């Protein structure tokens, strides 16, 4: 689909940036790659791994909530608390409400509510100090297409092209968007900045972003190969 397409584009963009060896310059000018306009519309603010039994629950920065169940289906609740979207394994979408929800989705809705009640009670909101970009009035939410965990990070792939990598050891985060061809870096101090990948290639960047972008390349290749 266009999803597969966006993974190829991200991979190419990362390969280009990394090939330029951005941290190896006469004078690194990372500030010149800053593009605050390119801040993402959506990222994952919280998640709960219950994949031993049901799947992975998460919340987007707009306070909407989703589940990617172990059967590769997705249920997403809008931040109005009533609008629902069910996505089947092959991507087929159905628009529903918790008011008029099909009986067949009883168990999954109950699980979504379990996750919803847990997250609004337990976890920090990633990028809480970040004001999202925009998107149009009555737009539909993206859903989690896939995720996996490594020793170093959890990798999250949204259906709108965005790949998020949260690093476990120091809580640094990357939000990558092929559409904007940009990367948002959240430092260990929860400070943040959005960079145009083409300008990072032009002007360079610090070792810690460069390193994380190398790992990001490896991760996006893994998403594509699977």
């Amino acid at each position: 689909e266009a999803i597969e397409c966006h993974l190829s584009d991200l991979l190419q963009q990362l390969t280009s940036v990394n090939a330029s060896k951005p941290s190896e310059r006469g004078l690194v000018r990372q500030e010149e790659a800053e593009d605050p306009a390119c801040i993402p519309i959506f990222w994952v603010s919280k998640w709960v791994d219950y994949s031993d039994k049901y799947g992975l629950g998460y919340q987007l920065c707009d306070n909407s909530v989703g589940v990617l169940f172990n059967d590769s289906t997705r249920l997403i609740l809008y931040n109005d608390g009533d609008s629902l979207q069910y996505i089947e394994r092959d991507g087929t979408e159905s628009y529903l409400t918790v008011s008029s929800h099909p009986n067949s989705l009883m168990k999954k809705i109950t699980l979504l509510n379990y996750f919803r009640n847990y997250m609004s009670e337990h976890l920090l909101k990633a990028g809480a100090n970040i004001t999202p970009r925009e998107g149009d009035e009555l737009a539909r939410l993206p859903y989690l297409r896939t995720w996996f965990r490594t020793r170093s990070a959890i990798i999250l792939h949204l259906s709108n092209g965005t790949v998020q990598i949260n690093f476990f050891q120091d809580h640094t985060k990357l939000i990558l968007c092929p559409l904007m061809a940009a990367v948002t870096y959240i430092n260990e101090k929860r400070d943040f900045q959005t960079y145009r990948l083409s300008l990072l290639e032009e002007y360079g960047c610090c070792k810690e972003l460069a390193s994380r972008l190398r790992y990001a390349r490896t991760m996006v290749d893994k998403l594509l190969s699977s």
């Binding site: 919280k46 976890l123 990633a126």
Partner: peptide
């Protein structure tokens, strides 16, 4: 197993 507390 969750995101950051």
């Amino acid at each position: 197993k969750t995101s950051t507390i």
